[PDB]
């Protein structure tokens, strides 16, 4: 749909849409930029992630509100709560499928540096995780496996190629721990991963500048916040 707009104009409009809190527009601009076929820079990857995180975040919040109402209802409330929850769920699944499709065509296969490849594989794990949040039954099993596989490949690369304080490595470990706790019914694995990630980052903080220290410690605090809730 964005095929007639210059790549650089799509990126500039994505930045404007972020400032205007127009995240659906932002995601459409960034989809158009990806579909130009060139690799994305560090900041362009961040724009892609912010746009879709906000779109799917609104959908997830709405799905949770509707699911809670539906669970309460089961007086006959009619089919409306279920029908509307299903509508939101289908829309959410479509956004996740769109993001996964961008990663598969062709962002991951062209990503050779650790920073880009880990970033995209973490996104792949995240969007399969959002699919898993709404999935049921055997569908849930294969979706869960797909999230786990993406996160595991990202973890393997990050441990070989990035320092333990790298913010992408830290955020990957945070989100994989949430996967273990909330999706995979593995709270002990979640706690172990968060603890080991925190401790290994702590021991590497001495190597960092003031600005990098702030970036890494911010994410470490999120690991600690989860550990406080889980223990």
């Amino acid at each position: 749909a964005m095929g007639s707009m210059e790549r650089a104009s799509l990126i500039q409009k994505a930045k404007l849409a972020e400032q205007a809190e127009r995240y659906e527009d932002m995601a459409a601009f960034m989809k158009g930029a990806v579909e130009k076929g060139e690799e994305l820079s560090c900041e362009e990857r961040n724009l892609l992630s912010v746009a879709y995180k906000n779109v799917v975040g609104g959908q997830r919040a709405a799905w949770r509100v509707l699911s809670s109402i539906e669970q309460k209802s089961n007086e006959e409330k009619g089919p409306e709560v279920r029908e509307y929850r299903e509508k939101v769920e289908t829309e959410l699944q479509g956004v996740c499928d769109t993001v996964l499709g961008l990663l598969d065509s062709h962002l991951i296969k062209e990503a050779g540096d650790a920073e880009s490849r880990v970033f995209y594989l973490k996104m792949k794990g995240d969007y399969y995780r959002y699919l898993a949040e709404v999935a049921t039954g055997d569908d849930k099993k294969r979706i869960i496996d797909s999230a786990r596989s993406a996160y595991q490949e990202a973890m393997d690369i990050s441990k070989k190629e990035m320092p333990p304080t790298n913010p992408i490595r830290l955020g990957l470990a945070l989100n994989f721990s949430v996967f273990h706790y909330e999706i995979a019914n593995s709270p002990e694995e979640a706690i172990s991963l968060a603890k080991t990630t925190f401790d290994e980052a702590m021991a590497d903080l001495h190597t960092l500048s003031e600005d990098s220290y702030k970036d890494s410690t911010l994410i470490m605090q999120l690991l600690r916040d989860n550990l406080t809730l889980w223990t």
Partner: peptide
């Protein structure tokens, strides 16, 4: 609990 949040703007 909490995953990485989006940055604010």
């Amino acid at each position: 609990a909490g995953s990485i949040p989006g940055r604010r703007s």
